[PDB]
Chains A and B, each alone.
Chain A
Amino acid sequence: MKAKELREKSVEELNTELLNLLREQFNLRMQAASGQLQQSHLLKQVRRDVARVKTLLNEKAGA
């Protein structure tokens, strides 16, 4: 999403949001290759979404 709501979150709550984003990306590219998904942009945004989580996970867990 945005940065700051994720910046208030815990480490393991960031981990379950990471897993939720991975499941979301999985279902999205399955729908994309299957012939569903008229709205492609979700793919890109979920990609950047995971990057956001991972960036905070490299700040919060140790750096």
Chain B
Amino acid sequence: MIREERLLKVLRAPHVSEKASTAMEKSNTIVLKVAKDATKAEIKAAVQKLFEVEVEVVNTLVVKGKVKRHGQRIGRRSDWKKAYVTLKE
């Protein structure tokens, strides 16, 4: 079918920062940069398919891009999506 093509196309990167690492250590939660559309069902299916780990719930958000000044020009960065995936215990 075409489901596994979508599941491989959803995930982009794991996010890395202090809040991501602290949520991983305490709350058993991985933070992922996902696709822009990327619903919670597609994210949960993709993590359970491509990391072979069981997944409890997904909280997503859309991070807005910051207007950066380069020389004299102004460029708004990409709007991307972030997913806090809570695994099992």
Chain B, residues 56-79, CB within 8 Å of chain A (1/0): the string is 000000000000000000000000
Interface residues of A in 29-46 (CB under 8 A from B): 29-30, 33-34
- Which single residue of chain A is at the shortest CB-CB distance from B50? A26
Q: In whole angstroms, how far apart are the Cα atoms of A18 and B12 in the complex?
A: 19
Number of B interface residues in the complex (CB < 8 A): 10
A-B contact count (CB 8 A): 23
Number of A interface residues in the complex (CB < 8 A): 10
Q: In whole angstroms, how far apart are the Cα atoms of A1 and B33 in the complex?
A: 30
Of A19, A22, A29, which contacts B13 at CB under 8 A?
Answer: A29
Are B8's CB and A33's CB within 8 A? no
Query: B residues touching A (Cβ–Cβ < 8 Å)?
Result: 4-5, 8-9, 11-14, 33, 50
18 pairs from A and B in contact (CB 8 Å cutoff): A18-B5, A19-B4, A19-B5, A22-B4, A22-B5, A22-B9, A25-B8, A26-B50, A29-B12, A29-B13, A30-B11, A30-B14, A33-B12, A33-B13, A33-B14, A33-B33, A34-B13, A34-B14
Query: A residues touching B (Cβ–Cβ < 8 Å)?
Result: 18-19, 22-23, 25-26, 29-30, 33-34
Apart from A30-B11, A33-B33, 12 more pairs, CB < 8 Å: A18-B5, A19-B5, A22-B5, A22-B8, A23-B8, A26-B11, A29-B12, A29-B13, A30-B13, A33-B12, A33-B13, A34-B13
